[PDB]
């Protein structure tokens, strides 16, 4: 069918009635012509690419942001001017999905270069490192990050500004908070047993006065109990767990995990009933139940992965495989409402370039990454089909903003995972 | 064999199922339980668990309410009920909480035949004459208002745990709605004189106690404001006419007729304000009226569910579903609809079916609660579908902060609650 300029253009029906981004829509009607270049379809105020035209029908692809679902069609001349227009009587029903996007940071010269600077959200350069992410418990607009040899920085959502908190520490691994949040605990990984492993930054000083809390070699992270407030940290040498009491300033060695050279961090469940022990250099996770009577973590047991087996394998418990797991985050799952454990554990699998999910029952799945048929890279979009990370390290779930923030190391950016906006 | 031996140990070897909740029939395996049910005491999560069978090497018990910890203890007793042997299971039972119907407020006396109409604390406020429409104060989530037809407009104050009377005297109060700024409460009166008021305004400045007439009109079955643009929509039963009132110009515009004469209905807007449900109380069906954002008006309605004039109790899609005297509804955010155009379900009272129904955005009607205990009307708390009963439920509100439903259960003179086990 050829377009007739002296005849009206009409939409009789469209299908499917429902869908979202990338849905292949079929539009029935009259006098569309068969030249794709002279047809303009707008869905929800957004341009929709026409992929087929047969005079009485046309195919188009539902674009991103087409939320209103209002369908407009125009027939154009060679110069792109509208010569006929029509509108559908019914609106298309748009279902939003989750996407990986770039929240903060940028690189320039075809993503080969980046600048280390303070500045607004739109002009703050690139992040040297974001290995651990933590919100201020007293201010949900303040998101802190540590970057190993790179500075400790602040992402302020209220002012839309990125600033430097503290510079100079050789290898900052974690951030945790005292029960009253009057202090920030910064953990430094260094080989001298007479030099500090844990530092404190006080709130009253604007986190400018730094204090040595404990001394110790090769500490890969520290974490406070969310109810009783005591600090747990390690030493890589024998893979020993230490308990520090803030009131008595006493350190107690607890158990050893397994063998020498055990690089791990401890992450408590929000109830404080247990912690996951994430062994970064041995590619497996353990669970350590909390003894409320002794106010101590107890002998842990393997929950998933296999000690020393680097791979990407989804499955239950010991059948699962990972490669360099980093920070995790406890996420409230509405499907678990009423159960003993209402949370899933989402974590960065750094050398698998993806985000994994560990359920309370020990099942490991992949949430995001490894899209576009590869592993490492820099790609936004569909969580499993398109999205790619390059050594994701830090991660935090934002319950108020209903999204994830990820420290994507080689891409020098803070990535976001949330529903399209 | 199968008899308890006082000189041998009592132990638990295993139990099944490993998971369940309230009323789960558990099977315990072990040694030396005996076969006398009266001398066996099982405790699950610190709560007494009734033993229903005992065969020496096995027993049956029922998981009680509040057994959340799942720790299992067993004791063998003597004739006087004292513990003579004690054991414990190595594993904890995994308890999954469920929703229950409970009585939140109000009471009746003399075998639920009489009730007192009085102001008082939550524990001693008598019974409710009526709670046909429930509405939270948008500026104070501790203040829950109710209207009761011929009975007074009352306040349920969660902060003070007190029930008070706000206004008395109106013949048939149907609905409550609020001005966009919530400086005023709109109270709708159903009366036959066209020269007498249908809509009253209660100022916040007076604690919602001083009244003023807003509009005049006969047989109005309810009014509702647009949640974004703030204009008022109300009806007239006579021709089933919808009217639009603009607060700034004080101009009433007749909009559209639903169908035929004697159409008793209320209008309830979706939280987005993109559409409203038109609930036809005396014709047992619901319509949807899309909002035209350009003209700032509701438009020509279309049937969403139920069959005009066909009274019944039938779960189903669209016109295959049946109801009998639907009353107030409440929009509840469903986490399963995250990202979709409509994220809410519509829960409503089906007065003469004595239950709570759910209308999904796709037009499916199901039953949420009521009609338990092999009956329809009654007064029973517990399991939503197996035990719970209502008697002419009318008002309903979902409390997002307290994560529960509050229901105006007319003949039971109580405010019922639907929430998870606590
Ligand atoms: Cl892929
Ligand atoms: Cl039943």
UniProtKB/TrEMBL annotation, chain A:
Q: Which residues form the IPT/TIG domain?
A: 10-92
| Superkingdom assignment | Bacteria
Q: Which UniProt keywords apply?
A: Signal
Query: Matching PANTHER family, A to Z?
Result: NHL DOMAIN-CONTAINING PROTEIN (PTHR13833:SF71), PTHR13833
The protein's name is IPT/TIG domain-containing protein
Upper taxonomic lineage = Bacteria, Pseudomonadati, Bacteroidota, Bacteroidia, Bacteroidales
